Amino acid sequence: TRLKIVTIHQEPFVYVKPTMSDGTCKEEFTVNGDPVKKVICTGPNGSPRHTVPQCCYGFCIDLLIKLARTMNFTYEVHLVADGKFGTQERVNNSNKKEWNGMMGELLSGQADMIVAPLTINNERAQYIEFSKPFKYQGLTILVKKGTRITGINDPRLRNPSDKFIYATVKQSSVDIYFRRQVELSTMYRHMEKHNYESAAEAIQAVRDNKLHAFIWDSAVLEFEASQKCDLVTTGELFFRSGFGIGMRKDSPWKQNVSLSILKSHENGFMEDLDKTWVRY
């Protein structure tokens, strides 16, 4: 009856911070002056996963609070136990494929809804229902201020050399996407020589002139350019998609969640969240 919401730490959609010493969330304010709405979300911090109450906020939490009031439901939030969004992986012995991450929790009933920047795509939609997108996004490129890259069809990307190094995060969804496209084979080969272990490290290497361009989520990258003013995004977005709320097939909430998201786009609520959390 309390919906179990699963989410994941992924700024700026979901921040995760420790509680104060009395177990409450610290009072904080957005640029606009409004108080930051925080919810308590339990989850972990080959280690043991001690689940402890933490604070969660951001774009996706704001959205959840609005959907809950709008559709009259109560909720409890936890962080995905294994820390992953969700891919299919082979069980040992090559029996079947099983979803891990938020996708696995949703399908096994450990959650009733995924509220996270969850990419809508074909493999997932075969198994779960997605809302209409609450955020349209895609990939862009992060470069030092001054650098001119038109997008994925720019000659310094199509015809790569060591003079202009570009890269993404190793084994990320982007890496996997590039590897599967034969027309991007030349680009993948250059990237695999240089892919970084995390987005944070790749962003730092752009700052330290060891990476000339970082290919990543546009929402994340626009948020990054807002903060650090020596970096910018450049070029037209490519490989566009959207984030959706995830529910199981024939969930009773599917249509009303989607209509509420459409309503919040149309009345400016979603653009207000974009301003609060993504751009500055």
Partner 1 sequence: DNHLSIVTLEEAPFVIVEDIDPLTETCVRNTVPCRKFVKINNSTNEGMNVKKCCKGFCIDILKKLSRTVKFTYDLYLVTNGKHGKKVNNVWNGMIGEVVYQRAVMAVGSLTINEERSEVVDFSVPFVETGISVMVSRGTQVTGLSDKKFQRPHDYSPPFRFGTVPNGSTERNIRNNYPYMHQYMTRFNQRGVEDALVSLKTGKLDAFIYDAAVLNYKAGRDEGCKLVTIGSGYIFATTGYGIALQKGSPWKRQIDLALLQFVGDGEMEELETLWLTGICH
Ligand X SMILES: O=C(O)c1cc(=O)c2ccc(Cl)cc2[nH]1
Q: What separation in angstroms does the CA of 168 have from each of 140, 209, 232?
A: 11, 15, 16
* Residue 58 DSSP label: S
Q: How many chain residues bind partner 1 (CB under 8 A)?
A: 31
Q: Among ligand X, partner 1, none, what does residue 85 contact (CB within 5–8 Å per kind)?
A: ligand X
Task: Tell me the C-alpha distance between 264 and 266, whole Å.
Answer: 5
Which lies closer to partner 1 via its Cβ, residue 65 or residue 259? Answer: 259
Query: From the list 54, 140, 172, 258, which residue makes contact with ligand X (rule: CB under 6 A)?
Result: 172
State in angstroms the smallest separation of the CB of 204 from partner 1: 27
Which parts of 15-111 are beta strand (E)? 15-18, 39-43, 52-57, 75-79, 88-90, 97-99
The answer to whether 65 contacts partner 1 (rule: CB under 8 A) is no
Query: From the list 47, 126, 161, 209, which residue makes contact with partner 1 (rule: CB under 8 A)?
Result: 126
The answer to whether 227 contacts partner 1 (rule: CB under 8 A) is no
The answer to whether 117 contacts partner 1 (rule: CB under 8 A) is no
Task: Please report which residue ranges of 159-268 form alpha helices under DSSP H.
Answer: 173-180, 185-192, 199-207, 218-227, 254-266
| DSSP reduced 3-state for 141 | strand
State in angstroms the smallest separation of the CB of 102 from ligand X: 8
| DSSP reduced 3-state for 70 | helix
The answer to whether 270 contacts partner 1 (rule: CB under 8 A) is yes
Q: How far is CA 189 from the centre of its chain?
A: 25
Task: Tell me the C-alpha distance between 232 and 255, whole Å.
Answer: 38
The answer to whether 80 contacts ligand X (rule: CB under 6 A) is no
Query: From the list 39, 61, 78, 119, which residue makes contact with ligand X (rule: CB under 6 A)?
Result: 119
Instruction: State the binding site.
Output: 117, 119, 124, 173, 217
- Applying CB under 8 A, the residues found at the interface with partner 1 are 120-123, 125-126, 130, 132-133, 136, 152-153, 177, 181, 183-184, 238-242, 258-259, 262-263, 265-268, 270-271
